[PDB]
From Swiss-Prot:
This is Host translation inhibitor nsp1. Inhibits host translation by associating with the open head conformation of the 40S subunit. The C-terminus binds to and obstructs ribosomal mRNA entry tunnel. Thereby inhibits antiviral response triggered by innate immunity or interferons. The nsp1-40S ribosome complex further induces an endonucleolytic cleavage near the 5'UTR of host mRNAs, targeting them for degradation. This inhibits the integrated stress response (ISR) in the infected cell by preventing EIF2S1/eIF2-alpha phosphorylation upstream of stress granule formation and depletes host G3BP1. It is found in: Host cytoplasm. It comes from the Viruses. Residues 1-113 are annotated as: Disordered. The chain holds residues 11 to 125 of 7096 of the full protein. Residues 2-113 form the CoV Nsp1 globular domain. It comes from Severe acute respiratory syndrome coronavirus 2.
Amino acid sequence: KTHVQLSLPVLQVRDVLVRGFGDSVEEVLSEARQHLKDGTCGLVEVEKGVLPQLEQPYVFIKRSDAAPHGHVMVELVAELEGIQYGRSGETLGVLVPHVGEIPVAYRKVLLRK
């Protein structure tokens, strides 16, 4: 399927133990996609002071369309030193590995895979 319904655990930035997916744009997009498939991916909502607490390259989920079954359609965009790889809509948040942190909420998304 080109899209997969996911419910992403929303983590507080200060709880996150593994603060990024790797060391290149291509690796972080790869790892993000693998963790999303494996149900081991969390979401941090981006506010003032969040991104400097996480590791670049960043992987964002961005709204790809204006929401089947409650699930917002999203796609992945990476960012490294202020350059983005991808073009999409509004940021829903930044993806990070999930290693058992307690979430504050869930974000229903339909991921273009």
